[PDB]
C-alpha cells in the first residue's frame, strides 16, 4: 500500500448534530485517508448494515479511489426503499440509487435525538414530482406542482400543492414512523490511482 | 417406512419453562420417534418460521435422520442475525450458522415470560472474543478479556472486560429490545438409515 497516514473523517459525518432532509441529502467526498470501517462495523449500534457488491468483512482489505458519504433521515418503515432497483415514494422522488450500486447502507434509529413531543417539522421530503429522479440526483426546486388540467402558477389552489411535506416525528410513534438516520457510502472501483485505502501495512 | 410410533418430544422442548442463554445455547438430539411438523407450522404464535433447504409444507413427507434442536433466547431486533451467511455480534461471538444449512429457524416473541419488572439479568451473551466462532460451536469458557496490551491476569481493571454481558429485558423495554425465543431445527441426509420422520 502507498505510504499514507491519516484517519478518514467518518466521525464527523456519523456524529454530526445536523442531518439534512431527504430532498436535500448531504453529500461529502472522502479521499486521501486511511479508513477503518471495522470501527463502525463493530459499533453494534446500527439497526441495519447492508453492503451491496462488497463483503463487509473484506472491506478492510479493499483499496478504493473515491468515497462518497450521503446522509439523510427517513421514516422507519421506508428504510427498505433505500436499495438498488427499489421503487416507492422515496426511492424515485427523493433519492434514487443506480442499478449497479457498489456501496453500503447504514441505517440506525434516532428516535430520541430527532423526534420531540408535539411532532418535529424540521424534516421535509418531496411528495409530488413530474418524473422519477435519475440515480444520484438531487432536486431542491420548490415549484408548485399542478395535479390537474388547471394550469395554476404560484397559487396553492384546489389542484396545486406544495411539493414538499413534513414528516412530523414524535416520540409516541411505533416502529415504522420513528426517525431513522441513514448514511450511504458509495465506493468506486475506478481504474485510477487509489487514494482511500484500508489499513494493512 | 419405520414401524415406530412413539411421538417425538416437541412439546417439552418448545414449551420448556426456561430457555438457556445464547452463549450456552441448549442443544438436544431427537431420534427414534415420529414427528409432526404440521402442527408447528399451523400455529400462528411463531412470528418467524423461516426454512432453508426444505419447504415447511414438505416436511411431513421427507424422512430425516438424527435431527437436532438448538434453543435459546436473544434480543428481538437482532433476530435476523440467526441465519446462514449473516454476520454480527451474536452471529459471530455467540452462535454461527453454517452456510450449507438445511433446516428451519422458528423465532417468536416471549416478552410475557422472559421480561420482568426488575429486569431479567439471567440471560447473558458473549461480547468480546479473539476470533469469530466456527459453525455450530459453543464457547462457554469465560475468564477475562485482554484489550490493553498488558497481561491482565484476573482483574477486571482498565482494558479488562468480562466477556459476558447481561441483557436488560423489561416489559416496557421497547419492542426491538424485547426478548425473543429462538429454536433452530437442523436436519441431515446421510448414507445411513433413517430414524425419525412424519407418519404414513
Amino acid at each position, epitope marked *: 500500500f502507498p505510504n499514507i497516514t491519516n484517519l478518514c473523517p467518518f466521525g464527523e459525518v456519523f456524529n454530526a448534530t445536523r442531518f439534512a432532509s431527504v430532498y436535500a441529502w448531504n453529500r461529502k467526498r472522502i479521499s486521501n485517508c486511511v479508513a477503518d470501517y471495522s470501527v463502525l462495523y463493530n459499533s453494534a449500534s446500527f439497526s441495519t448494515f447492508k453492503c451491496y457488491g462488497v463483503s463487509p468483512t473484506k472491506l478492510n482489505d479493499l483499496c478504493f479511489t473515491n468515497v462518497y458519504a450521503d446522509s439523510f433521515v427517513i421514516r422507519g418503515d421506508e428504510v427498505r426503499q433505500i436499495a438498488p432497483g427499489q421503487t416507492g415514494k422515496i426511492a424515485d422522488y427523493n433519492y434514487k440509487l443506480p442499478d449497479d450500486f457498489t456501496g453500503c447502507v447504514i441505517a440506525w434509529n434516532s428516535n430520541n435525538l430527532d423526534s420531540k*413531543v408535539g411532532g418535529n417539522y424540521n424534516y421535509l421530503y418531496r411528495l409530488f414530482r413530474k418524473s422519477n429522479l435519475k440515480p444520484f440526483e438531487r432536486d431542491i426546486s420548490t415549484e408548485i406542482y399542478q395535479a390537474g388540467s388547471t394550469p395554476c402558477n404560484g397559487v396553492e389552489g384546489f389542484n396545486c400543492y406544495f411539493p414538499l411535506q413534513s414528516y412530523g416525528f414524535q416520540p*409516541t410513534n411505533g416502529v415504522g414512523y420513528q426517525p431513522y438516520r441513514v448514511v450511504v457510502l458509495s465506493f468506486e472501483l475506478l481504474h485510477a490511482p487509489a487514494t482511500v485505502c484500508g489499513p494493512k501495512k | 417406512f419405520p414401524n415406530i410410533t412413539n411421538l417425538c418430544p416437541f412439546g417439552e422442548v418448545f414449551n420448556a419453562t426456561r430457555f438457556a442463554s445464547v452463549y450456552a445455547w441448549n442443544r438436544k438430539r431427537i431420534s427414534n420417534c415420529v414427528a409432526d411438523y404440521s402442527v408447528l407450522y399451523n400455529s400462528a404464535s411463531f412470528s418467524t418460521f423461516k426454512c432453508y433447504g426444505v419447504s415447511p409444507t414438505k416436511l411431513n413427507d421427507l424422512c430425516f435422520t438424527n435431527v437436532y434442536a438448538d434453543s435459546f433466547v436473544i434480543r428481538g431486533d437482532e433476530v435476523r442475525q440467526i441465519a446462514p451467511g449473516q454476520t454480527g455480534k451474536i452471529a459471530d461471538y455467540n452462535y454461527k450458522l453454517p452456510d450449507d444449512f438445511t433446516g428451519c429457524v422458528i423465532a417468536w416473541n416471549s416478552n410475557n*415470560l422472559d421480561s*420482568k*419488572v426488575g429486569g431479567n439479568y439471567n440471560y447473558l451473551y458473549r461480547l468480546f472474543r479473539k476470533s469469530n466462532l466456527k459453525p455450530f460451536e459453543r464457547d462457554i469458557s469465560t475468564e477475562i478479556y485482554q484489550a490493553g496490551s498488558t497481561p491482565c491476569n484476573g482483574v477486571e481493571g482498565f482494558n479488562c472486560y468480562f466477556p459476558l454481558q447481561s441483557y436488560g429485558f423489561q*416489559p416496557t423495554n421497547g419492542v426491538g429490545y424485547q426478548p425473543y425465543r429462538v429454536v433452530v431445527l437442523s436436519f441431515e441426509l446421510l448414507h445411513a438409515p433413517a430414524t425419525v420422520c412424519g407418519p404414513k
Partner: antibody
Amino acid sequence: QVQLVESGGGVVQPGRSLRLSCAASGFTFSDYAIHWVRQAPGRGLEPVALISYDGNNKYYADSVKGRFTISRDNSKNVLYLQMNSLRADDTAVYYCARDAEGGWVAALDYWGQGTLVTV
Amino acid sequence: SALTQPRSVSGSPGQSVTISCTGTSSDVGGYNYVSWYQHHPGKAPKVMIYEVSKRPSGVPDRFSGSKSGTTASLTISGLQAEDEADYYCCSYAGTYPYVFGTGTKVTVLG
C-alpha cells in the same frame, strides 16, 4: 384463582413502627412483581413501594423513600412492608397489588382488599 | 408528580362522557403505556384500560381510550348506575414507581 390478602394494622402513635404482611395464592408467587399503593382519605391513589420478583430491586416514592422497607419471602409465599417513624400524613388505606409484568404491560391486574392504618 | 385530572364530570344516562389526563415529556406524552382503572367505593380497583387503548377481558366495549400529544382521554358511552365510581389515570415514567392521576368521579343524573 389468584387471591391476595393483607393482615394490615390498626392505630399507631406517631414516630413508631408498623409491620404489614401480604400473602398471595393461586399463582407462582416468585414470578410477578408487587406494588404497595396508598390512598389517603379524600385524596387520590399514589404508589408507595415496589418490589421485584426476587426482591433484589426495591423502589420507593420520593415522599416515602428512606423510611419504608419492603421484603419478600418466596419460600413461605409472603411479603412484608416495614414502616418507621410514622407521621400523621401516613394515615391511609394500603393495597398490596400484583403487577401484570409481561401481560397487560404497565398495569396492576389483581388487587387485595386493602387495610386501613390510622395514626 | 401526579398527572392532572378533572375533579368531576357529569352526564345523563346514555350520553357519552370523557375524562382527560395531562402529563409531560416523561409521562403519557412519552412512552405509550397509559392505563385507566376504576375504584368503586369499598371495593378492590380493577383495570379497565391498559396500554392506552387495549382493554382487558370481560370489560364492556363501551369504554374506549386514546392518547394525543401529552394528554390521554378515556371516553365512556352509554353510562349506567354501575359507573358511579372514580376513575384513575396511571402512566409509566422512566422510573418504575408509577405516577397516578387524580380522583375523577363520574356522576349520572337520576
